Every structure is written in structure tokens, then in C-alpha cells.
From a paper:
In bacteria, the recombination mediator proteins RecO and RecR are required to load the RecA recombinase on ssDNA for homologous recombination. RecO is a key recombination mediator protein that has DNA- and RecR-binding capacities. RecO alone promotes DNA annealing, and it stimulates RecA loading on ssDNA when complexed with RecR. To structurally and functionally characterize RecO, we determined the crystal structure of RecO from Campylobacter jejuni (cjRecO) at a 1.8 Å resolution and biochemically assessed its capacity to interact with DNA and a metal ion. cjRecO folds into a curved rod-like structure that consists of an N-terminal domain (NTD), C-terminal domain (CTD), and Zn2+-binding domain (ZnD).
The crystal structure of cjRecO was determined by single-wavelength anomalous diffraction (SAD) phasing and refined to an Rfree value of 20.8% at a 1.8 Å resolution. The cjRecO structure contains all the residues of the cjRecO polypeptide chain (residues 1–204) and takes the shape of a curved rod consisting of five α-helices and eight β-strands. The curved rod-like structure can be divided into three parts: an N-terminal domain (NTD; residues 1–69), a C-terminal domain (CTD; residues 70–134 and 173–204), and a Zn2+-binding domain (ZnD; residues 135–172). The NTD is composed of five β-strands (β1–β5), which fold into a closed barrel defined as an oligonucleotide/oligosaccharide-binding (OB) fold. The hydrophobic interdomain residues combined with the internal residues of each domain form a continuous hydrophobic core that penetrates through the three domains. Despite the extremely low sequence identity, the cjRecO structure folds into a curved rod-like three-domain structure as observed for ecRecO and drRecO but with relatively high root-mean-square deviation (RMSD) values (2.7–3.0 Å for 173–185 Cα atoms). The Zn2+ ion is located at one end of the rod-like cjRecO structure in the coil-rich ZnD and coordinated by two cysteine residues (C141 and C144) from the α3-β6 loop and by one histidine residue (H162) and one cysteine residue (C165) from the β7-β8 loop. Thus, cjRecO uses the CxxC…HxxC motif to coordinate a Zn2+ ion in a pattern similar to the Zn2+-binding CxxC…CxxC motif of drRecO. In the cjRecO structure, the Zn2+ ion tethers the two extended loops of the coil-rich ZnD and thus seems to stabilize the hydrophobic core of cjRecO at one end of the rod-like cjRecO structure. In particular, in the cjRecO structure, the positive patch is limited to NTD and CTD and does not extend to ZnD (left).
Author numbering: -1 to 204
């Protein structure tokens, strides 16, 4: 039975084999690939079609691997950003087994949007969806530190946690624009430098 997934991480084992961590629509899989170091289809961030052979008391063996390429796979700039996000997502999901199809479907949509959109903008939009799906999005701007309302200029920290600029160091964004971003799920309201700063917050960890 074929399955599809995104490779989130690989680790060399034995001479040329790989342990391959794969996000599917049902599960984060930890699988064993014979001679995986030789296989140009097996790289973090790649999407694959594959099958699994179950093994008693051991990892499933990764078989029947077909690389599902991206239209933009040759653009090293975009692939760098993609692999940064994938590594952040691996660390976020590292201890998870079963999970919602949300995560696989989110990555599928990112890959599509990567064709024509700015990769950092796509990741910023995607992270907003992760926060909302996990119930971690603070749409009310109450300061994490002093518990008071924050108005007009909002400081954001890791995981878009809100603060007064006088209460914590982070990056500042206009309230009206953050509200538009959170409502529309579209970071188009922010200019390029604001996107860069949201992306720096994402790189603190999901
Ligand atoms: Zn405060």
C-alpha cells in the first residue's frame, strides 16, 4: 500500500543506511532505508511516495521510494528556506507519533505556494495556521509580563507571544496590521523587513 510523506530528518546508520523520519497524513514515521546514503531521492524536505515493511521489535523498512519533485526544487534560495522550516518542524514534532492530517496537508499547500510566492511569506502564513490549529495564537494583545492591554504597537516574541516594548525585547508591529494578518491569514499587509522579523521569531522555534 503506497503512502506519501515529507522527509523531516535523516541519520546515517551502519555503512550506508539511513534512518528516515517521514511526516505522513497520519503519523510521524521513523523508518529504516537500506543504502539510503546513495539515494538522491532521500533528503530532508523532499516529498516521497513509499511503502513500509513492518519488522518485529524494530523500525519499519522504507521501500518502493519515488521522489515527488517540486517545480521549484532547483532554486537553491527557496530550498534553503524550505529546509530551515522543515528542520524547525522536525524539532517541534520530534516526540510525536500519530498526528492530525493538518500538518501533511499544510506542507503540501506550502509546496504549491512556493512556486510563485516569497518563501518567507509562505512560511510566515503557514506558522500562523500552526499556532491557530494548536490553540496557541494570542489574538488578544495582553502582555505576557504585566497582563495589561497592549495598544497600537505590539511587540512579538517567540510563538508570536505579545508584549509591551517596555516589558520585553522583541519585534514591533502595528496593531491594525497584526489584526489584519490574524483575520485574513495573509501576511501581505507586512512589508519585506517586517516579514524578515516575523521569520526571525519563527527561527526561535515553533
Ligand atoms: Zn507589559
Amino acid at each position: 500500500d503506497p503512502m506519501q510523506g515529507f522527509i523531516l530528518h535523516t541519520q546515517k546508520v551502519k555503512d550506508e543506511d539511513l534512518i528516515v523520519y517521514i511526516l505522513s497524513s497520519k503519523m510521524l514515521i521513523k523508518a529504516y532505508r537500506f543504502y539510503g546514503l546513495r539515494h538522491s531521492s532521500i533528503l530532508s524536505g523532499y516529498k516521497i511516495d513509499f511503502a513500509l515493511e513492518e519488522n518485529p521489535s524494530f523500525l519499519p523498512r522504507l521501500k518502493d521510494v519515488l521522489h515527488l519533485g517540486f517545480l521549484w526544487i532547483m532554486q537553491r534560495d527557496k530550498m534553503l528556506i524550505w529546509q530551515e522550516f522543515i528542520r524547525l518542524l522536525y524539532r517541534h514534532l520530534k516526540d510525536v507519533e500519530e498526528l492530525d492530517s493538518f500538518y501533511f496537508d499544510l506542507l503540501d499547500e506550502c509546496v504549491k505556494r512556493f512556486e510563485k510566492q516569497n518563501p518567507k511569506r509562505v512560511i510566515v502564513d503557514a506558522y500562523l495556521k500552526i499556532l491557530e490549529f494548536e490553540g496557541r495564537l494570542h489574538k488578544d494583545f495582553f502582555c505576557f509580563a504585566c497582563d495589561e492591554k497592549i495598544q497600537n504597537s505590539i511587540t512579538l516574541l517567540r510563538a508570536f507571544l505579545p508584549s509591551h516594548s517596555q516589558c520585553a525585547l522583541g519585534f514591533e508591529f502595528e496593531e491594525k496590521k497584526l489584526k489584519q494578518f490574524y483575520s485574513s491569514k495573509n501576511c501581505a499587509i507586512f512589508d519585506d523587513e517586517e516579514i524578515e522579523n516575523l521569520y526571525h521569531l519563527i527561527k526561535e522555534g515553533l
